[PDB]
Structure 1
Amino acid sequence: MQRASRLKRELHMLATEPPPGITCWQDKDQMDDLRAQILGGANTPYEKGVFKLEVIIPERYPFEPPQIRFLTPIYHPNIDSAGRICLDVLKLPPKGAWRPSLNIATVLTSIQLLMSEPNPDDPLMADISSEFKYNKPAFLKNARQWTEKHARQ
């Protein structure tokens, strides 16, 4: 029931005053699911990219974190091609950090933020993480091409 109230508030707050470069709407195809979009960050290889996400709010939400996937392939140290995100706020604690103090808006913000500043210590793509650590240019090139291949129109 905490589901119903959370969804009602967050949906309309995200429809009228979302965080900038982020959108989140009730998936038309799946009005239990959400569709999220992250716009390609300025001064990143993800620049000129529209990254679609499937945002499922578990039935125990907000006591449990959202289950969110990238639908857009991304070249990222901490995010595999299938869209899985290595980020503590998508898991219950002591390992994760989810609580109803946080929400869809603040976690989509933490995601756009990680997209800006990858954390190499939770690597999903070891190759991408070592290339990010040693060969910034190759990573930036492959990721920007990735943006123009997958996050384009």
Structure 2
Amino acid sequence: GSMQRASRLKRELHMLATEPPPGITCWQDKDQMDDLRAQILGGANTPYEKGVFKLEVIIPERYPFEPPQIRFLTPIYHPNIDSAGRICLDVLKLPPKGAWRPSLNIATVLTSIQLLMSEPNPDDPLMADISSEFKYNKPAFLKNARQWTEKHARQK
């Protein structure tokens, strides 16, 4: 990619290293500024509480004009996230349907995903059956979401 992309990534890795949003961390997997990983802590008072969720964060060649490409590596039980970790979230897509713009950044999208974990959009699901459970049988949703968290997001 370009020098301007390189330069922007150096600045974002700096901010992600020194002022990460609460509950989030993001780092270079090895020596490439565009092959990143992240971690989001399950939020308190959510079924994901105490889980630790890892994600792959790939920065496309045309960043920042295309959004980061992000998927969960740790399985998670959620209306908007599929069994391969694909995430349905507006800021991960370009307009007109999406909301990605170059004034957003790696940190703000990881924060949007963290918020999506607390506040699902059952209206625009990737997982139709989880989405129905969330809407109509919340207690069963919360229970299944805790159990998936215990099974996959707690090595302890």
- Bin for the TM-score computed over the shorter chain: over 0.9
1:49-98 CA-partner distances (Å, limit 9, x unpaired): 01000000101000000100100001001111211111111111111111
Deviates more, 1:130-139 or 1:29-38: 29-38
The residue aligned with 1:2 is 4
- Matches of 1:139 and 1:17, distance apart in 2: 34
Q: Cα distance 1:32–1:107, how it changes in 2: closer, same or farther (>3 A)?
A: closer
The residue aligned with 1:45 is 47
The residue aligned with 1:16 is 18
The residue aligned with 2:131 is 129
Asked if the contact 1:14–1:24 (Cα under 8 Å) also holds between the matched residues in 2, the reply is yes
Counterparts of residues 135-150 of structure 1 (less than 5 Å): 135-150=137-152
Asked if the contact 2:9–2:33 (Cα under 8 Å) also holds between the matched residues in 1, the reply is no
- Matches of 1:122 and 1:30, distance apart in 2: 34
Q: What is the CA-CA distance between 1:32 and the residue it aligns to? A: 3.8
Asked if the contact 1:2–1:62 (Cα under 8 Å) also holds between the matched residues in 2, the reply is no
Asked if the contact 2:76–2:85 (Cα under 8 Å) also holds between the matched residues in 1, the reply is yes
Q: Cα distance 1:7–1:133, how it changes in 2: closer, same or farther (>3 A)?
A: same
Deviates more, 1:26-35 or 1:128-137: 26-35
Considering only aligned residues, what root-mean-square deviation do their CA atoms show, in Å? 1.2
Asked if the contact 2:10–2:33 (Cα under 8 Å) also holds between the matched residues in 1, the reply is no
Q: TM-score, normalization: structure 1?
A: 0.96
The structure 2 residue matched to 1:92, chosen from 87, 91, 94, is 94
Q: What is the CA-CA distance between 1:28 and the residue it aligns to? A: 2.7
Q: What is the CA-CA distance between 1:2 and the residue it aligns to? A: 2.5
Identical positions, percent: 100
Provide runs of 4+ in structure 1 moved above 3 Å.
29-32
- Matches of 2:113 and 2:143, distance apart in 1: 21
Unaligned runs of 5+ in 1: none
Corresponding residue SS for 1:8:
helix
Q: Cα distance 1:30–1:137, how it changes in 2: closer, same or farther (>3 A)?
A: farther
